[PDB]
Ligand binder design. Structure first.
Ligand SMILES: Cc1cc(-c2cc(C#N)ccc2O[C@@H]2C[C@@H]2c2ccc(F)cc2F)n[nH]1
Length: 287
């Protein structure tokens, strides 16, 4: 079973789509080890996450749980789950298609060159902050807030960013070299403690990813170097051209004591105040 928002659910509640109704159009990218495709359902445009047939039994239940988790969110900044095709092999999860791709790539592919403005970055930040607030309000801890796990509806104007992957929260419902150490607060990678204030810290790092335009956090540092850097009180410098009000949100997210970090209602509040400052949204992005 899986529980969320006071309700417990099982596989039966997922809407099973007859395999005959599903057509694969494109490969779209890889994952930890599974694949994602562009797909049709008779005609609806979907993304299809596939479970390799060459997989263990823990994998089986991992894949099922992810479907249950995503199915019980009802929020515009969290990708929708359209159904499943689990009674045929390979097993499918049908998901909202995000034509903008992942946020990390979009930021790198869109880095102004010989297009974007500060306000577009704030809306992406606001979008993800809105979803995180919905998760916190419902007592869901994502554990892996990061640009690679966010998607965009479209690359152009009017894009909406949404949280698009929940593999981490499913794993705790693989190893040290696989932990997202660069997105985790001290109490997390030191004690294994996880709360909504853990996602708060991660969002601050995501915020740095957004306003660096897709850079890797702690650019020249390794995982262990970041662990010693952060535990000692070290923090990243502002991204190039980052407005103070935006950097000041990152630093509040990175408070050493979780209970000096803001919740996601306050982060939204402060992001919205940033969209209201001309001196912020008129700041030029670096080329
Ligand atoms: C669920 C879903 C994926 C997509 C999707 C669309 C396009 C288009 N054009 C290109 C890539 C897409 O995902 C690729 C696998 C990587 C990914 C990143 C972050 C995530 F959070 C989840 C992901 F799968 N649309 N919907």
């Amino acid at each position: 079973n899986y529980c969320f928002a006071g309700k417990t659910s099982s596989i039966s509640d997922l809407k099973e789509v007859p395999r005959k109704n599903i057509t694969l159009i494109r490969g779209l990218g890889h994952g930890a080890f599974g694949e994602v495709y562009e797909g049709q359902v008779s005609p609806l445009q979907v993304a299809v996450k596939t479970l390799p047939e060459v997989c263990s039994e823990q994998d089986e239940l991992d894949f099922l749980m992810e479907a249950l988790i995503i199915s019980k969110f009802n929020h515009q900044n969290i990708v929708r789950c359209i159904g499943v095709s689990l009674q045929s092999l390979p097993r499918f999860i049908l998901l909202e298609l995000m034509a903008g791709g992942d946020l990390k790539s979009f930021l790198r592919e869109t880095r102004p060159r010989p297009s974007l403005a500060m306000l577009d970055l704030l809306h992406v930040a606001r979008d993800i902050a809105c979803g995180c607030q919905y998760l916190e309000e419902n007592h869901f801890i994502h554990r892996d807030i990061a640009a690679r796990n966010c998607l965009l509806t479209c690359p152009g104007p009017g894009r909406v960013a949404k949280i698009g992957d929940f593999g981490m929260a499913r794993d705790i419902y693989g190893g040290c070299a696989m932990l997202p150490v660069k997105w985790m607060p001290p109490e997390a990678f030191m004690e294994g403690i996880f709360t909504s204030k853990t996602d708060t810290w991660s969002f601050g790092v995501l915020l740095w990813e957004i306003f660096s335009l897709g850079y890797m956090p702690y650019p020249s540092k390794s995982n262990q170097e970041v662990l010693e850097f952060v535990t000692s009180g070290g923090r990243m410098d502002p991204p190039k051209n980052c407005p103070g009000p935006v950097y000041r949100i990152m630093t509040q997210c990175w408070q050493h004591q979780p209970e000096d970090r803001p919740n996601f209602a306050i982060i939204l509040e402060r992001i919205e105040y940033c969209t209201q400052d001309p001196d912020v949204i008129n700041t030029a992005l670096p080329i």
